[model samples]
Target chain A: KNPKSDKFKVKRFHHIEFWCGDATNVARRFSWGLGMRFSAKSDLSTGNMVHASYLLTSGDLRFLFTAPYSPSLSAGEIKPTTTASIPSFDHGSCRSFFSSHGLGVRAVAIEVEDAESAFSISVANGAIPSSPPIVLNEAVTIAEVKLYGDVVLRYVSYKAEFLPGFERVEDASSFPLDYGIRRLDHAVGNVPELGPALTYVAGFTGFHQFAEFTSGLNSAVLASNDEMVLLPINEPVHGTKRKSQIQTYLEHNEGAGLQHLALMSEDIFRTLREMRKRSSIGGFDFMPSPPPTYYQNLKKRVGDVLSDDQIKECEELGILVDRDDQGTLLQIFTKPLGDRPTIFIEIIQRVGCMMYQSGGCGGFGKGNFSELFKSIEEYEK
Target chain B: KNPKSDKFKVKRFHHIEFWCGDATNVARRFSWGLGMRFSAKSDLSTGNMVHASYLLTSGDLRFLFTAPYSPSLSAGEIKPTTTASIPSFDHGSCRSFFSSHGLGVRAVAIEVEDAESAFSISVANGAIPSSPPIVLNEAVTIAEVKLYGDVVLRYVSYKAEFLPGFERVEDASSFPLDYGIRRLDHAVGNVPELGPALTYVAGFTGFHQFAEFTSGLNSAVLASNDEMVLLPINEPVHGTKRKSQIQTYLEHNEGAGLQHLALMSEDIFRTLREMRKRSSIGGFDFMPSPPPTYYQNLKKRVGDVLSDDQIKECEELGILVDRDDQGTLLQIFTKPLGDRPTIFIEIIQRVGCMMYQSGGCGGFGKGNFSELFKSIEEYEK
Candidate 1:
């Protein structure tokens, strides 16, 4: 490979689009919760169709949510056969139904400068080409892949020879104010059968096995690089002990796609502090806080590894810590993006070493697994 | 109607649920775009599922996006055969080929105090029942009807005995904020054959003929009452207009369901202004500015009927306006809520009149029709 042009110049995150069942309410909720702003709204002239795009940014991170146009064209209104039965329950019956029986995240999209090359690379790695390098106008070409099942990854490139709308902002350093994507932080993928597929994907994508964990807690494998293209593949681990959560996710998300994206910050504690303040001023809800025990116990377990300042920082920022043979990492997870428990993100920062490990095999000392088990057992009772 | 303990004394909006193919992203977008907030997120342990519940002062909304949790327990994914192709392009593509399509919106829900009573009223008015009142739990009862084809409207009753989470908020003054929704608002319907079905529904539901428009706009009728529960029925107006927007909608959305929810705000200008500002700060792009002439001509045509202030408001807020013998109404439409161009909403406010009319002709405005037609022509080209 030529050192000059072959070296991929990675950009920061762009936006993600999901083919949801209900667009109107979904759009409404996202705009309210995430503080996402709406950009363009359009309707397909020939169909009962509609579309909208929203944007969210933090430093170099930019995210978007898009949906269809009209409710008459909603998928639920069209295909009743696929309707999942609503179970009998109480005052919050719908909530129970939704939590257990709703579809999850569908796709994740990343931006790139070379649509053709990216497309070719993705295809070589088992991704099925969905949209080819279709040239829009004379400046931009978009290539997309529907990998595994429904996960989508797209490469968008603009001809440098001509300037298109917002094309001038593609240069990350020069257009930091306009367009800046720090790196490809992390993407979460859910699957029904995790083992073979996870192993296969790691080898297939050349993603080094960074960390692995399994217990009553969520089973996940974090694979990443210095470039920060982190990929977390997860599947429900079989155990009568904590099968409910995994079962719920599998049922709700349909099958699998990109569940969530975690963005990294060099100074996560400070960044989170700033974000929390911004959320308060903007009338945005702060992310839910985990139990206090989660933070207090971290010092006793991994106190020697991180400095007191670091430990205090993680606690103040409400970040979770997970350690393995490789090293310990600081992380926190966001709730799913929408009403469905499908897509969510984990903000993570690693120091010293690079290996994927999710707390220890014994369940990160969460102390809630037994409570969860009791809840399930009681429900069965 | 007996004045029994079961009777509801209040006229407050309750809750609404919509079924779609996916929920995660849609929920976030809707919450953010419409200024709603999610109160709770839950995962069901009973089956393979996950779901979310959002809150608005008037009521709460739930979204269910679900799939098979396990192959053994799989209810089976919806398969589109030649006999039944899902109305959207994505569905068609998936059905034609055995590839997985993304999630779809599947159901629409409304909350009432007495589901059985509501069902009786709906049935008395001519609504066809899909499912009878089913008690999910102690506090809720549900009744469902397939309004036209696959579009489902579920009425739920929440008992006063129990208060679910978030219902305990004490801010009753802002119980129903000026977020544009005065009540449940109207649910638009589209059907394959608009004539008999439309008339049948209007006659059955006791919904008076609010307005009627036909000809090149095809055939459409609006039916509603003082409660603002309006339903617009649509079919192909002219056989020659093979590519009519309604026909396309019917073709894509399959049969029919709730089309859009028209949220009413006291001050359109102020509401839209807030929306625009919020969108910008949230990093969303600006909504497309309609052709300058559209606004200019609207002013010239509807001169004196509406104030210069109103016309200018539409221009600045990117709202669309139309007039007829009935009166003039200010409106704006959004793009699709998903990839399939299905499910969106219309922000509408009726001025000086209570009826629904499109343009002066009782259909989509000439300019709007021509704009769509031009777009179709371009697509064909």
Candidate 2:
């Protein structure tokens, strides 16, 4: 399908950016609620008047939140202008996307060797260019193309530790209090049709289908050549007694969009335990624990992939478990990040599996799809 | 002067409501960052699909935040309809305000003997009505009239424990971890011109001018007949080497809006200490401290109003001190709450003063304006 493979290779995800109402408050929530440490910022104080952006880092995980200034602040129009080595924003598009989607993903930036070549190849392969490559300096070059929903697929070739145009925050702590959260494992998108989305993404990036499932929702996972970036596209499957959970997400998110992010952690128990400590005082509210029966049967289905103690902790914390020949998988989900039932977070750990390097790992939790659907139905309704 | 016979009586501030992009996240900030307990909510779970509202309380202070749903969620028009005893919002207006102002105060509700009479009299006195009186039930009736800077002065006649239409949150702990924060002290608004704003508010509510200051900014404090609610209106004073702080607020807020809210505490040291503990962990960020010389001369300026220990603690925490004939006032300010330099919070304690009942008190920190302005200019610039 790649027409003799004229595809530009993509590396791992650079970062995920969210368009928010107040970047300060939202970023603080991520810091307090999820232990994402503050890294850098670009704001009015930093000579970026068009918008305020905050960068958060936890291990290899990087999140950027941006909130646009009102048009009035820019004199009746959101004029993009650069100052003090700061980047300009597409203020109108950012504002429009936030207006409709609330606090949601704006872009998923992927790292590549050559951003210019990536943009050129993507546009040649039927992808619409959102922005031409901009060489900010020798260390960074950036470009964008439209992706599912209102989000964009950004390409960056950077040689800097921190993002360009952002002033690094002094004393920005690293992972001092280890919660084991490492980097992004995979991101899932809720689309109206999975086939078309998968086909389009595959056409441009030359990503091959890695996995497929039809449990509650039709899904297809695509991966880059090196298997560093995994993107699963989902669409609701109909003709059931109750409406599909993916259908509700589409309705709430208003269209196709990034539904959830899977944050790879080295130890799920430690990360979840630390996260739960803050939940009683306004931290992340996770989903309810699955039935005790699910845990009782978990051992039988997944075999001894988990120890007895780990299984007990899994039941206690409502962590889901599954297995493939490669290794075991432990996972849990948080409630919607904001008021809308759209964007959420998934904490996951793979034991003895190297999906980022090779491929197969725990089969993408296909074994736990029934309980996931049940838990969501009860909460959403 | 008010026509004594015709002026309707008002009691106190019922609650201050903020129109936000995401009420859930913002309300969590107040709960986690400022120790306000989450008291109740009305939203999708409560059958209110138009918007999500959360109520937070600390002592007698109540803050409500409402975030509107996108128009697409309501079938592309944002039609207003009540469901399950919930009140509907002016969706278009709320969205417009949030779009222009970010997260900001939308309404300051006051308790009154009769909402109907309050609205009618205010309208007759040249105030524009934003909403007519709505008698939700025997226990509650509400109306609104426009206040300065895209904000509304709401009147509520209520007898319920919580606001009407909101279900109690069952387990909301009240002041369990006491920070000595008791209630609202006063709220200040920034306007392009103060005289007209003061006159318009005074004409409708018959509030008398309680104090005046021309330090850095022109400000006049207005109080009701009972002096329970004090409102300070401020405007820029030109011809200075630097622009007035109030002018910057007006510019960033687009026109006029609530600039800050002073939270009254009984023990400034304890309240500030607890707040400071959270500052490094994504809590409120306080303004920079004044120069050492200012604190060294504090005893000379304010006399022995603060004990030696209290003064030392004050200097350590950067809390400012001012005094009047009635008592001593200790106050400190947090940096702007959001990205733009618009809204913020003031934590204060009045020793041996009762301004809520009687007007005379430790004054409005006129002596500290120079230090305050200097701190702001350094931080903002």
Candidate 3:
């Protein structure tokens, strides 16, 4: 087999980066909830400012959050309305203050086999190269994928690729240095309208629609596995719906942005166990409590595959389980990493499961929407 | 003091919020580096998105990151450029991918005493209100500050009427419970031109002319003790700086946006220690290791004020120390909490010393233009 063949090629998940007000807090949450380990940390100081980075991972997946040392942008005078100007009114004090604090989601980082090739592919596929591939530290060549809106996806290709320490590799019992992440698990998005935008994304990315749920229930669309990447698109279900979680998200988020990344793992139980232990050592908080009803209803709904002990273990560990007709999958949702309700990770183990299941609970099943909604409602109230 | 008089006061710092591709990553990095704790973490299911919050000092200051749960905003055909229209562009596949992968910074959050009053003040001060003050929670009410440019600031007011955790007294801390922050450690801003634009920010924001470092430094600033904020405005320092961090932040940020907020703390040592311990327990990595020369040179310059051991401790812990004619201060910088390098924190303890000691060791006590130049050089190379 050609090593360079697409089938044989695998892109490593180097790190997921976030633009946040505080890198320390973001690192703590990831270590606590997702079982990621910090690889490197640094504060690059220039221009009377400071910034830092923390790398965390299990196996091939790595998560990183970066905080700027200084606020580099400010709200200024509104551009004069000309014939070409839009009639949008300036959203004053609120907008200015919001812009002032500078705690927002920044960027996401992923490792690819070839930075130049990946950049080319992205550019050819309608992406403007925000930053061309530039080698960093001799080993890594970093390139950024320019997006349409205000988000950026940074693709990094390591010269001497190293496998993530925390993955359950299938081909070999021992970890291979070259072994790394296969594809994206799922990327969560937030927008005001749900159906139309999701459809647009599917058309644009050539990502197949895997699962979708609408109505009073929370709506989400899971993208098909591209190689190994599974992206999920979500939006608020509009209308005067009884206070649903989407409304709260829209109200809180203010506009559209990236929400979270659901990372795939082979053995969730093991992965979560490692994460929990790692988190404890890192001095991060414990994972939030899982809904009690989820455990009670698990056996009745999932049935027979995992023993009562496995279900109990998941519950005790705050791991969520979701299932579809295909099979049952184990999963868990983490709290936000930054000041804004942005940037978190979803550790998932697919046991032949095709859909997201919030354990056995019916509402927003698989995605843990019910529990999240309850949490948000309690927070807002 | 008349409580009514304080009712509409624009107190100190509050919280900063941003939109991110992932909230978990944001929370983790911030919690670890800045010593911020998570007050609340939740997922917004109605929109299938997740959000999280971290407190600067438990309840006083908070930072938030919100991630979209689904794709609700997508690129559509421009309805033709017209006045009064919100500028629309094809973010292309990269942006779509960014939105899908949950990457980039979104918004900023700031604290205020009275949301309505703050809104009015901003409006009177030439700010536009994008939206009315919206209640985020019972404790926090937020109003958006619309600037002339693309920046937006959230004016958050915390209700101190009832102190659940503390005893309500006639004369509590002079710091408004709503205005629970000390001073502005630092802030990041982006502009088209560094000189005029930043100078404009200095005048507009009432920031005092702090210091100026240029060329490879590529940043200018004005800070205000009265306002308790440091506004650092930046433009490309190097023409080859296309893919540099500053450039990437500006490009993806789309015009000027609030980049980061640095909250001031009275006790840098204790605050940072506690924050580090707490964040570590919660699973965040503390930035360790400062260049040995930083400490070596400090002794030679500052004299025998601090013990060698103390200086070593700071270096090992990656804490930065600055001494001016006014006094001395200790600080630590964190890496970016998100991808765009938009936000981070500076843990500062002002010791009445004021000589801009931070710039002393670098180049004739000027400013670290070499560091900035090196960073740009690295990116460009």
Best by lDDT: 2
Q: iRMS values in order, in angstroms?
A: 9.4, 3.1, 12.2
* Model 1 TM-score on a 0 to 1 scale: 0.60
> What TM-score would each prediction reach against the true structure?
0.60, 0.93, 0.48
Q: What share of the true interface contacts does candidate 2 keep?
A: 0.57
B318-379: candidate 1 lDDT, tens digit per residue: 88776665555666766544444335566556655534432122233334556434444554
Instruction: Tell how far residue B373 is off in model 1, in angstroms.
Output: 13
lDDT of 3 by residue, A1-381 (tens): 112223112343455555443455555554555545555454332111223455555566665555443222223223331111111112232122223222343445555677767767656655656667665446666677533134555666766623221122232111122112223465666666766665544443344555566534345553323334444555655564476555554545455556766667666667666666445222223347655665766777666777899888887788777666656666676555333344455666656433543221121244455544554556555
Q: For candidate 2, what is the TM-score? A: 0.93
Against the true structure, candidate 1 has what lDDT?
A: 0.47
Top TM-score prediction, candidate number: 2
Would you list the clashing residue pairs of candidate 2? none
- Residue B284 lDDT (model 2): 85
Q: Candidate 3 chain B: minimum summed lDDT over ten consecutive residues — where?
A: B82-91
Chain A TM-score of each candidate structure, as shown: 0.62, 0.91, 0.64
Worst 10 residues of 1 chain B by lDDT: B81-90
